[PDB]
Design a protein around this nucleic acid. Structure first.
Length: 49
DNA sequence: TGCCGAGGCCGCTCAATTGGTCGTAGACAGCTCTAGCACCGCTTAAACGCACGTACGCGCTGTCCCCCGCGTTTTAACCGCCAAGGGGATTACTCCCTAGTCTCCAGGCACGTGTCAGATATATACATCCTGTGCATGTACTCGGGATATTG
């Protein structure tokens, strides 16, 4: 049902296991990488096909 | 110079108040009482309030005559302060005991009536006690002089 999830990277970018998402959009970006890497790899992980 | 070190602005997360919504349980408002006994209306023969010079009692008044007030300033320590120290008032936790609930259960006594008496009120006669008045001394007072106590 739910088309889109809205997150802030520091709140939702860790641990969350959002394997249901086909795609990721950053509306803005932080001065520090690694945050975004976590935010992406909490979709991109072993559960996906 | 350098470096950097120290420096100054902005999203999480938690923790009281605040206000909102849920549902349910006696307790409030109201009805009909009904029922009855007080309020009323209606007389009566009743007490006690009240509008009203005058005798006159004292509240208020025109005088002079003095202490305590009124004014000054030195000082004197009273009272305020701040800062430090010690503990004891305080806080937060864990174990514990009973405060509180309900429930059953009885009879103690506070409740109520049933009769009718020793009580106290009211009158008349009255004597007596008590008030208001008038009337001596006896003291408690104000003063002066000296002894004892106490402050500086």
């Amino acid at each position: 049902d739910i088309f889109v999830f809205l997150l802030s990277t520091r709140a939702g970018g860790l641990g969350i296991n959002l394997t249901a998402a086909d795609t990721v959009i950053f509306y803005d970006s932080d001065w520090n990488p690694t945050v975004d890497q976590q935010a992406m790899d909490r979709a991109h992980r072993l559960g996906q096909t």
